[PDB]
Amino acid sequence: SFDGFFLHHMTAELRANLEGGRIQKINQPFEQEIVLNIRSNRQSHKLLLSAHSVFGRVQLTQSDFTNPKVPNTFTMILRKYLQGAIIEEIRQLDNDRILEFSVSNKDEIGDHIQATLIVEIMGKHSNIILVDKSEQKIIEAIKHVGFSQNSYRTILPGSTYIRPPETHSLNPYTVSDEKLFEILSTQELSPKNLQQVFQGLGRDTASELANHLQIDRLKNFRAFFDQATQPSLTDKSYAALPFANSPENQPHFESLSSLLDFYYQDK
Secondary structure, three states: OOOHHHHHHHHHHHHHHHOOOEEEEEEEEEOOEEEEEEEEOOEEEEEEEEOOOOOOEEEEOOOOOOOOOOOOHHHHHHHHHHOOOEEEEEEEOOOOOEEEEEEEEEOOOOOEEEEEEEEEOOHHHOEEEEEEOOOOEEEEEOOOEOOOOOOOOOEOOOOEOOOOOOOOOEOOOOOOHHHHHHHHHHOOOOHHHHHHHEOOOOHHHHHHHHOOOOOOHHHHHHHHHOOOOOOEEOOOOEEOOOOOOOOOOOOOOOOHHHHHHHHOOOO
């Protein structure tokens, strides 16, 4: 699934191709989707950012797009900040389904412009938010959300950016030996409870994880998260590793992005 774990692998892939890259073009070919043409490593890349409530995702793509004639105000402000900008850093927020693109640019007079494009993948509450580095203020957002008594946050130009409400879960990538030892040593290790204790684990992932924690648990835990990216289809979905019961007649995907190009082909 497109969980936090999968995002860890995808982030890695995106960085290898795009970090240090230059944003050539910005387009919004569909309602909740933005595509950035990027030049990096003497290759030209297409980066898809989707806050679609059902198919929300990030990936490079080989797909071609028919861009609208008349740009929108959101695109316009994005272009104004990102066109020609350099992608200095791509960073996942902990093991959550949130990805940040730190870009640098110059304004009309040569002064240093720094922004952070934030992609929050949370189903129907997904968003793409441009934020100013210095004073953490929202520049623009693909979906604006008012102050409401209902909310811990406001999503509007000028608003102060607060990250989605922190959870009690633990990043499984940064869990210390001692803390990790006591968990695997005293807690229930069912797929469901693993989902609870750790950030960014989908049900498919946590299930696969579980099959690996009956012995040598500490080292086994480490080993699962240290596996190399191996893009595959699963029973109902896709993953960055070949989970149990994966289809058997499967092509070798040269990347997670080609995997998703394939999976989302028919919408």
